[PDB]
Amino acid sequence: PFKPRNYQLELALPAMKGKNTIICAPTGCGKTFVSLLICEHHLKKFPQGQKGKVVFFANQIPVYEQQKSVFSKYFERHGYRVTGISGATAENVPVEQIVENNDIIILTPQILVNNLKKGTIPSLSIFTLMIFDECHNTSKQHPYNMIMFNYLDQKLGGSSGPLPQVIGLTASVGVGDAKNTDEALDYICKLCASLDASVIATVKHNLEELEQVVYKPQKFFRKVESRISDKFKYIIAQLMRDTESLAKRICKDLENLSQIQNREFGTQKYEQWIVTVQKACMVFQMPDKDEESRICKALFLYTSHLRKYNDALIISEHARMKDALDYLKDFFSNVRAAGFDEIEQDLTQRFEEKLQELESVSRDPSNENPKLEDLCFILQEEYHLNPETITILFVKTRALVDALKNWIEGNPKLSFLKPGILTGRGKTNQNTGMTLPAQKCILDAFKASGDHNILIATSVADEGIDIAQCNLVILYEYVGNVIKMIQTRGRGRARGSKCFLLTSNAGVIEKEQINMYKEKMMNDSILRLQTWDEAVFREKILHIQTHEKFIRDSQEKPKPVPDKENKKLLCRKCKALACYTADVRVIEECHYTVLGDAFKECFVSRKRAKIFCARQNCSHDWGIHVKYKTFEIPVIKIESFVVEDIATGVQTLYSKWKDFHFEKIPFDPA
RNA sequence: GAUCGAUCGAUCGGCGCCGAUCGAUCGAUC
Ligand SMILES: Nc1ncnc2c1ncn2[C@@H]1O[C@H](COP(=O)(O)OP(=O)(O)O)[C@@H](O)[C@H]1O
Ligand SMILES: [Mg+2]
Ligand SMILES: [Zn+2]
């Protein structure tokens, strides 16, 4: 099979002695083989009559599947029962029939957290070796931190029998959130205490052998100047000024709904301001139902158009003007066919008046994004120096991912590129997201073989996913903490690989330099901590654990009070009476629906039949029809309703059903 | 294999929230 290297045996030396250690090593050095060697040494040290029990806490379903596969390929020869439980498994063979019947369990932290919460698993004393893959995720309320909280509550105070040995497989301790070396050392000590670890053993003796396996790529900053002749920006700013003037003429109180003083077009500040104004416009009270409905609908349309224009301006500064124009046209086409209105027709005519000028300006070779020009130049230079490279170009947004894909596919200069999309699961407001097998089949085709030359990922290909050794780590304005910097930089580990960082905003290069200084400070702090004695560090982590336990078990009572009186749910756009609180039924605490014949004639059905408001021109989505065991009763979304009291006139808003505190009557077919 | 609803957690940016990114769990569907 595989032969253990020198550094792979050095990293597993303190773990094989019986002490809780943290294995810090660069990404791609083979920490999985170190964990396998530790598991083999742990399961072979028990005398006759007893038997160990190892649990490997993964973080992702692909990572969990890969770990289960490698553990089965490595351990089924010795005669150990390797198993794995996750979200994909069916409601059968309870965990007590799997944990008490196997030796190596590849688990997910939320499954064990739920099992310890509902009281299925008695305590963590059943296991003998817990291995947390990428233990840097131990944070304020991470499921790793919940398992560690349970372990510490079992250790401190109510001392139970033998406790399992905790071992981390992180790649970076992530001193992020700290300022100087003292705060970095404090954070490292806090993390080692939360994980109950006494050793941060790293490769120090045979460091020359590690460089022949993993190669730290050289960083390359690229500050590009913003465009000067931006006619698209000017036209969209004029349209936004016209829309804001109309909204102010119809409202007369827009300057007092938000506290934002200086709001410039095409920034996140204007987005926050317009979101606050939209959320404050839905809360209106006046003795005129039709007038209030008309005013609120007009204000909702105005703020929706302003937010869409601001999103188009934000997309225009990161991609081509054609992408922002296509986004605006798609939004206008989707909102025009929904509902025709006077304000809607006015805004559509005002937009189509400048549509020809926008089409003429966007289709200009001189009006090209300088960031995209520099990216194309870098790609040309890299693929001309070596035509066998693979790019792992990182992007912040999904819309920007699609824009970069359409730009690469539609560029005569970039004829040698075969782009690939890699997004995350779960639907969004615009995108639908990629599933697990789609991600797997796309990542399996991105390598030196072919069918793919550049993977346009977005914050998903830098956590736990195994990818081929890349030669280009261009970061299209994608920065974060020191952990994210080390994770993305660790993707390209081939011989003679670079890591480009393109940006057009003064401050991103400063943040990347701060992250590099924080990484150097983290390395210095680890080197300083690796010189302390075992007793002093054990006493320090014990004091930190005692303080954390005293702080944690003192404020864990966020108990609310349920509401009793009836409340009505008016629409969010037109503010029409939809239903009351007494008619809202709850199926299984996650299927909030409405029961009543009055509500059936208050929506229109247009995946499954998504419902919309039954008014003249509203087209506001309330919810969707779900096919239950027998019925097809529709569920609603609280993100499209406003709650109004019957006695009082308050109109507070709620983002999720958990914030809405009321008498949740359980659903009943009878 | 493809959805839907709910919930949790982490990260980034901006003024406790908002927007974005990702991960997971629980339930039902085809
Ligand atoms: N002793 C070894 N001999 C051969 N290949 C090894 C050895 N140790 C590790 N590797 C390779 O290194 C890779 C490391 O992958 P993985 O552990 O998932 O990522 P990371 O090392 O970043 O945690 C494995 O795919 C394995 O093939
Ligand atoms: Mg790993
Ligand atoms: Zn409506």
Q: Give the residue carrying structure tokens 């590099």.
A: A516
Tell me, yes or no, whether A295 and A394 share the same domain: no
User: Which candidate, A121, A260, A141, places its Cα nearest to that of A194?
Assistant: A141
3-state SS record for A579-643: EECCCEEECCCCCCEECCHHHHCCEEECCCCEEEECCCCCCCEEEEECCCCCCCCEEECHHHEEE
What is the total count of domains within chain A? 4
CB A498 within 8 A of CB A472: yes
Q: Is the minimum distance from the CB of A73 to ligand 1 under 6 angstroms?
A: no
Eight-class DSSP state of A412: S
Q: Is the minimum distance from the CB of A60 to ligand 1 under 6 angstroms?
A: no
- Identify any residues that bridge with A205 across adjacent strands, giving them in sequence order: none
Tell me, yes or no, whether A112 and A188 share the same domain: yes
User: CA–C1' distance A222–B21 (Å)?
Assistant: 23
Using the atom order of ligand 1, give the atom closest to the CA of residue A26: 22
Tell me, yes or no, whether A64 and A197 share the same domain: yes
CB A130 within 8 A of CB A147: yes
User: Which candidate, A483, A541, A543, places its Cα nearest to that of A185?
Assistant: A541
Tell me, yes or no, whether A413 and A538 share the same domain: no
* CB-CB neighbours of A146 under 10 Å: 18
Identify the H or E element spanning A537.
helix A534-552
- Burial class for A524, CB neighbours closer than 10 Å (0-12, 13-18, 19+): middle
Q: What residues have CB less than 8 Å from A147, skipping those under 6 apart?
A: A57, A109, A112, A113, A116, A124, A130
Tokens of A174: 């992530």
Relative to the alpha carbon of A578, which ligand is closest? Answer: 3
Q: Is the minimum distance from the CB of A491 to ligand 1 under 6 angstroms?
A: no
Residues near ion ligand 3 (CB < 5 Å) are A 571, 574, 613, 618, 620
Determine the Cα angle at A116 with ends A113 and A118, to 5°: 105
Determination technique used = cryo-EM
User: CA–C1' distance A165–B14 (Å)?
Assistant: 43
Tell me, yes or no, whether A601 and A658 share the same domain: yes
| DSSP codes joined into one string, A294-313 | HHHHHHHHHHHHHHHHHHHH
Tell me, yes or no, whether A665 and A544 share the same domain: no
Domain stops at, among A308, A339, A368:
A368
Cα separation values, A599 from A95, A585, A594, A603, Å: 43, 13, 7, 7
Please state, in angstroms and rounded to a whole number, the distance separating the CA atoms of residues A566 and A561.
15
CB A80 within 8 A of CB A103: yes
User: CA–C1' distance A182–B27 (Å)?
Assistant: 47
Q: Give φ, ψ of A377 to 5 degrees.
A: -65, -45
Tell me, yes or no, whether A525 and A449 share the same domain: yes
Beta sheet of A218-223, edge-to-edge order: A218-223, A498-503, A475-476
Please state, in angstroms and rounded to a whole number, the distance separating the CA atoms of residues A397 and A405.
12
User: Which candidate, A360, A368, A332, places its Cα nearest to that of A348?
Assistant: A332
Domain stops at, among A542, A561, A580:
A561
Tell me, yes or no, whether A320 and A298 share the same domain: yes
Residues 493-522 of A with CB under 7 A from strand B: 511
Tell me, yes or no, whether A236 and A222 share the same domain: no
| DSSP codes joined into one string, A422-455 | E--SS--SS-----HHHHHHHHTT-SSSSS-SEE
**Bases in strand B with any atom closer than 7 Å to a protein CB:** 1-15, 17-30
A87 is in an annotated binding site: no
By residue range, what is the domain housing residue A462? 216-228+369-532
- Burial class for A276, CB neighbours closer than 10 Å (0-12, 13-18, 19+): middle
Tell me, yes or no, whether A192 and A96 share the same domain: yes
Proximity of residue A176 CB to strand B below 7 A: yes
Residues 32-91 of A with CB under 7 A from strand B: 59-62, 86-88, 91
CB A240 within 8 A of CB A348: no
- Identify any residues that bridge with A86 across adjacent strands, giving them in sequence order: none
Tell me, yes or no, whether A220 and A353 share the same domain: no
Nearest nucleotide (C1') to alpha carbon of A432: B3
Give the count of alpha carbons within 13 A of A297, CB side only: 24
* CB-CB neighbours of A355 under 10 Å: 15
Domain stops at, among A545, A561, A577:
A561
Q: State the angle between helix axes of A181-194 and A143-155 in degrees (0 to 180), rounded to the nearest 10.
A: 70
Tell me, yes or no, whether A164 and A257 share the same domain: no
